[PDB]
Amino acid sequence: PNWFNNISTDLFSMPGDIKLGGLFPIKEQSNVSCDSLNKDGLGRALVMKYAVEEINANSQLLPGVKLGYKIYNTCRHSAVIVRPALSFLTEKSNGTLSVECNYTDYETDMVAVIGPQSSEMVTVIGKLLGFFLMPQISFGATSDKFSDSLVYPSFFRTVPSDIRQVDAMVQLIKKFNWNWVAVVGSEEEYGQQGVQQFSKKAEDMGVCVAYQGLIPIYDDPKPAIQTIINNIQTTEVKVVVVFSLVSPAVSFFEEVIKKNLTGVWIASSSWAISDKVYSLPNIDSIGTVIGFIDETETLELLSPFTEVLFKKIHEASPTEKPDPYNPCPECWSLSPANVSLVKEESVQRTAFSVYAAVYTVAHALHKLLECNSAACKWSSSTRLYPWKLLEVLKEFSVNISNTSLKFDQNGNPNIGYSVIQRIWENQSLSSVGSYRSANLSINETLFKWYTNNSEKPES
Amino acid sequence: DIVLTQSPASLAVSLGQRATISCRASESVDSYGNSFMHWYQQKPGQPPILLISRASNLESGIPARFSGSGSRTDFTLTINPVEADDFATYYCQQTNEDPRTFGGGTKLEIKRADAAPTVSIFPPSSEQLTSGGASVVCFLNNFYPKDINVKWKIDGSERQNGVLNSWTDQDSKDSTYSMSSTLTLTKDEYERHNSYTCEATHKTSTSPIVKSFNRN
Amino acid sequence: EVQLQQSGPELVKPGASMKISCKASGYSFTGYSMNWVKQSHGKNLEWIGLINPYNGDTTYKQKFKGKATLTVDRSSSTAYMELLRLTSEDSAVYYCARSGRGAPTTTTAWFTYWGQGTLVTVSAAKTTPPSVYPLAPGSATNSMVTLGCLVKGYFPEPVTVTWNSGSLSSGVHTFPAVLQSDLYTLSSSVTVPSSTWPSETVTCNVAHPASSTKVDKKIVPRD
Amino acid sequence: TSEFHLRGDYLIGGLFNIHYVAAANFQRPQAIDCSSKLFILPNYRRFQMMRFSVEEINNSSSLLPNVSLGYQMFDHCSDIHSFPGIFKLLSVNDLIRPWEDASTGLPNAIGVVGPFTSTHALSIAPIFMTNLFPMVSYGCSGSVFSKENLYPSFLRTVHSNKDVINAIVGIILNFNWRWVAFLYSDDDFGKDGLEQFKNKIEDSEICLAFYKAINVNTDYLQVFKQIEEQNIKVIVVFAPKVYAEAVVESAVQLNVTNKVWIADDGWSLNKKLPSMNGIQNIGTVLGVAQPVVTIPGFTDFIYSAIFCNQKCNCSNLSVKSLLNADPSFSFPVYAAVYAIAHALHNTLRCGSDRCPKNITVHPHMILEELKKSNFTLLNQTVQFDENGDPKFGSLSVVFWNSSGNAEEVGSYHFQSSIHLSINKTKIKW
Ligand SMILES: *[C@@H]1O[C@H](CO)[C@@H](O)[C@H](O)[C@H]1NC(C)=O
Ligand SMILES: *[C@@H]1O[C@H](CO)[C@@H](O)[C@H](O)[C@H]1NC(C)=O
Ligand SMILES: *[C@@H]1O[C@H](CO)[C@@H](O)[C@H](O)[C@H]1NC(C)=O
Ligand SMILES: *[C@@H]1O[C@H](CO)[C@@H](O)[C@H](O)[C@H]1NC(C)=O
Ligand SMILES: *[C@@H]1O[C@H](CO)[C@@H](O)[C@H](O)[C@H]1NC(C)=O
Ligand SMILES: *[C@@H]1O[C@H](CO)[C@@H](O)[C@H](O)[C@H]1NC(C)=O
Ligand SMILES: *[C@@H]1O[C@H](CO)[C@@H](O)[C@H](O)[C@H]1NC(C)=O
Ligand SMILES: *[C@@H]1O[C@H](CO)[C@@H](O)[C@H](O)[C@H]1NC(C)=O
Ligand SMILES: *[C@@H]1O[C@H](CO)[C@@H](O)[C@H](O)[C@H]1NC(C)=O
Ligand SMILES: *[C@@H]1O[C@H](CO)[C@@H](O)[C@H](O)[C@H]1NC(C)=O
Ligand SMILES: *[C@@H]1O[C@H](CO)[C@@H](O)[C@H](O)[C@H]1NC(C)=O
Ligand SMILES: *[C@@H]1O[C@H](CO)[C@@H](O)[C@H](O)[C@H]1NC(C)=O
Ligand SMILES: [Cl-]
Ligand code: NA
């Protein structure tokens, strides 16, 4: 398309009449120095850039109004994320945050927040943004804790709560007649809640959880990982649910391989399509991996858009523009050789979640400003208060591309899951079914069993 | 104190068939909505092993062949099908009130086809002859059932004095018993005779099984 | 996994006292009652009592009050039973057994883990090593031949018997000892193929730990 | 003037919650009027304990000589609506500057005492941790606050949930009952309690036969019906005043009888329940409790005493009721103030009868001294381990006796072979 030609080379900051805050895990600690590039995170940030450039190109969506944003790195670290979250709340005209008892008439610099990705990070800023009644739409944080509007008053997400994913997992386990399982989680909000939710549902459906353990994310995780694997071996479970963030999952499966364990592994959406796990030497020996990921559209314009953008960035790269809080210092050297960032499977299959969060806000604004296709009831003197936009997002319905998105009273989307399996031979993911509403629908015949005789394991 | 009476005191059950064992308490062993009677298996020389707790809950590790039922004062252990290594004494135990008590146990024997004993007789070793003692040993091995009669005969004449008899426990593979019979003499009395005979009578035959040696 | 390791067999004089130990490993020791069980030669099982190792509270069956004393040493994860003023009536196997998990009360707990048991002989008589004589088939053949050795005049129990230091397992019969004049006698037989004797050797290895005597006897034909 | 505000050379923030209100949806981004909600007598007592401590230090010519301590205190009945007060404490001009350095920049306050509950702390602590602004909590017992890397400038003058849960497990192991119900508040405090409990009893004879999250919507008829059906005798109640009262009041009303109740130290010295009508019928109440620590001068101080969220609306108040209220967390408030005051004193390099005035004080300087606190106070030794947990304070076992008192029947030994001892004779079942 043509409007690709007039896109700005600014990744993390775009000027606009109305602005969104973005929080992405762009650079993280290796194991406060945030020096390790998170390619999935940087990739997701680019989706937001794409969505906003596209919204501005669309002549009929916010006709008179230009949408812009500021995107900051979270480092998935509470000290790092607090500062941008407060920056979003500064007086639009001032650059500073007033101390007040009443913010009803207070015009924040941003009108809504996109992100953060992780549940731990939502627990850091969610109540702060909730006090301001500033709409927050996460493209990634799945913890069921955020499903209570009395606790998280302005939180939405374009991915389903994990209370539904564990229900999908328990239904698969029942369908295959497995009744003796272990469950492993990372020792933080996502994994902790996932393990607890799973254990409760498994019991409700008469599945005996043999063992249950958590992988440390701060202290050296190998001792606990050994304890965990020892229990798995003594209980003799052949099915283990791993409800874990990637880095603990990597550490866990490193040890799984060393001890030459084999079985069925059920992946939560956080590592189910992770190249970090799937590229570990001898991972293909651990057996059968069945995963659950968010059911998403593919954005076929994301890759083409990103080629053009990375071209324009190469062109402008002799220019200089210095920042202690640069989300990504090394991104100045992006050439078309880095489009791989958005071609990556983990990004392609989750991109729509970011894109849907940005568009939800844009359509909500379009409605707030009493817009039609020609003009918006807006001018340079219009005052936008996040609490008014929030009023519009409550129980919002909107069509985005081919998806009919509906938010319930909890801020939860009517979005389900795809069930996939890792096919070791050609480093791929095959579709073995879906989960929609409360209905698991799998085709047993489509499953491949990496067992001695290729038959489905155990009973 | 709760008295537990088991019945039968002993039983023999063929491979593949059903063993039923019951336990009766002098008072109810129910409380907390449960029945606190448990079943244990014990092989000779070993600690008891818990099979079943709370009347009917099978412990992990224990074969599905074992199951229990009952409440209040009447409880039953069922072994089905019986396997060869199930020879043991089975004990009930009540833990509903202090002091915990056990039944006197039920001894389960594996039933099999009648088998004749294999008889071997051994003279005193020279090494023992020196010390002035003479033990004549007779092995009666791998027979069934356990009931057997051995007589010693010296120079054609019967002897009962000085004989010590010992029986193994049931073999866990072939379910037979074995028995040793030891005739201990003085070296002197031993040298006072020529023929030494060990004579086994068992229900598998109306003719005794006979093994002899001559001292010369 | 859970192990309860009891101390070895003991011979003790009438009137003396003795303390049996039970070392627990593989679980949190103060979390479960440790029970003690007596089994006399007649094989009746009898609950002696239990101790709460968290605080040392004890509960006894009445007839063992003042006869048995339960203690724990939390610093070594070990339960102890001290038996006082022993009579020949106290001769028995004594077990320790851990309460399980699932009962409503400490009273109702069943026994999920057991020590291997401690044989206590209460006798005035004296330790005496065994004599070991070979049993060779006396100048008599068929396809399989039966040999043995006679283990005579020892005290107290136990004795272990093996054939070729373990390699001979099948066709072995080791008979329970008989007690005579404060002395034990047993015998062991072994049945081996006729072609494998007196060709390849067959020795029986006796061990009497109570006098640390360990002896062999290769079984040699008679002439 | 006002109770909530005191001018001084240096200011301490005080975060309290002396009114209670259940969570509710709101439509405007604005503070809540906490002064029209339910008054909490014992929390107001702890509120006064901070005012007393500061005044006592300002009366001293040896600790902070000629350097006055002031405060800004708040009544945050809602953790989500507490941010105006928090911003006030951290602002450098009645302005917040999000990118401002931890070094350069002088916030309104040098540190903060509080808040009381884990929920309050979780909502706000990250904003404080960012520039290492020191928080010394007199009540927060969530185990997650022991993680230095998540809460680098957070210290506390009370024990973690692990210690109380160990004491509670100790009580249970001392008697014969091994099925247990665990009723926990449906919030961060209660849920951490439940996890610690599960972890502690897992390898033990104790069986968790029933547990349940207690909240405003709890159907108590069904809870006690399920407990009764499972024949459970021991009921642990791990929950703050409002939920513990709802549990026990409901039990009386629903004819729950013959139980053994076990309180955490948050309600074992509750003053409403032990004399409540029909209390005797539900069974025996045991508990883990903070020993009553006498704070000399406080009684006198109280006789002499009686911006959003700085209004008590508590004027017709009986001095006697306040004096006799649950005195739990008293030494923790008192020590929290003194810890900050000593930290300031040492940071200013104060001597015996004067402090230098050439030194500029930054909150993170106060933090560095706080972490190496080492001083005596009413014959206790105030210190914090590496994680910012207190190395002082003990726990005792109480039994609610017939004259309505929480009688001491035992104590919890942090470091000994028998971790918990109980004179069982004192308990009348
Ligand atoms: C807060 O400000 C708004 C708008 O000025 C006003 O309508 C509202 O009544 C104020 N809130 C309070 C509690 O006075
Ligand atoms: C893009 O590619 C270059 C060369 O492979 C690499 O050094 C650089 O780090 C990449 N950029 C990003 C943002 O990953
Ligand atoms: C919006 O959603 C409804 C229901 O999914 C759909 O029928 C309709 O075509 C959509 N309308 C627009 C204007 O996109
Ligand atoms: C890889 O192999 C599978 C069969 O296991 C096949 O179904 C799939 O089409 C292949 N993947 C690709 C990307 O061609
Ligand atoms: C499931 O897949 C198998 C194999 O591809 C196919 O035979 C069958 O038509 C499918 N079943 C359903 C119900 O779609
Ligand atoms: C004090 O609180 C009561 C509610 O308990 C309320 O009715 C009253 O208006 C308040 N008084 C003042 C002066 O704010
Ligand atoms: C401080 O001193 C004043 C008199 O100057 C006295 O009235 C007050 O009670 C003292 N306060 C404390 C807390 O010791
Ligand atoms: C004490 O400090 C105050 C203000 O900080 C000052 O005015 C006064 O001079 C000082 N007093 C003495 C005795 O140094
Ligand atoms: C009423 O109270 C008594 C107290 O002993 C109790 O036993 C009885 O079961 C209760 N009745 C009902 C219906 O709960
Ligand atoms: C604390 O202070 C005392 C008194 O000065 C000192 O003796 C002791 O060494 C200190 N203790 C620690 C742990 O630093
Ligand atoms: C109850 O305990 C209190 C405080 O320890 C004490 O004053 C009182 O004597 C006790 N009453 C009874 C009946 O034990
Ligand atoms: C235990 O409690 C009783 C009061 O019921 C008391 O008389 C006795 O002194 C206490 N025993 C000890 C050893 O302190
Ligand atoms: Cl994030
Ligand atoms: Na002073």
Numbering used by the authors:
A (entry chain B): 21 to 51, 63 to 353, 355 to 491
B (entry chain L): 1 to 216
C (entry chain H): 1 to 140, 143 to 225
D (entry chain A): 25 to 330, 343 to 465
Per the authors:
The taste receptor type 1 (T1r) family discerns ‘palatable' tastes in nutrients, such as sugars and L-amino acids. The T1r family belongs to the class C G-protein-coupled receptor (GPCR) family, which commonly possess a LBD, consisting of ∼500 amino acid residues, upstream of the heptahelical transmembrane region, on the extracellular side. Here we report the crystal structures of the T1r2a–T1r3LBD heterodimer, with a variety of bound amino acids, providing a basis for the understanding of the broad chemical recognition of taste receptors. Although attempts to crystallize the T1r2a–T1r3LBD heterodimer alone were unsuccessful, co-crystallization with a Fab fragment (Fab16A), prepared from an antibody recognizing T1r2aLBD, yielded crystals, enabling structure determination at 2.2–2.6 Å resolution.
We found that a variety of L-amino acids, such as glutamine, alanine, arginine, glycine, and glutamate, but not D-glutamine, induced FRET signal elevation of fluorescence-labelled LBDs, which we had previously found to correlate with LBD ligand binding. Some of them, such as glutamine, alanine, and arginine, also induced responses in the full-length receptor according to Ca2+-imaging. In the crystal structures, these various L-amino acids are bound to T1r2aLBD in the cleft between LB1 and LB2. The α-amino and carboxyl groups and the Cα and Cβ atoms of the amino acid ligands are located at almost the same positions in the binding site in T1r2a, and form hydrogen bonds with the protein, including to the main-chain amide and side-chain hydroxyl groups of Ser142 and Ser165, and the main chain carbonyl group of Gly163, all residues in LB1. Notably, higher affinity ligands, such as L-glutamine and alanine, are surrounded by more ordered water molecules, implying that the binding site recognizes the ligand together with the structured water in the hydration shell. The way in which the hydration shell participates in ligand recognition as observed in T1r2aLBD appears suitable for polyspecific ligand perception, since replacement of water molecules, rearrangement of the hydrogen-bond network, and charge screening by the hydration shell allow diverse ligands to be accommodated in the binding pocket without varying the conformation of the protein. Not only T1r2aLBD but also the overall heterodimer structures were very similar irrespective of the bound ligand identity (Cα rmsds of 0.4∼0.7 Å).
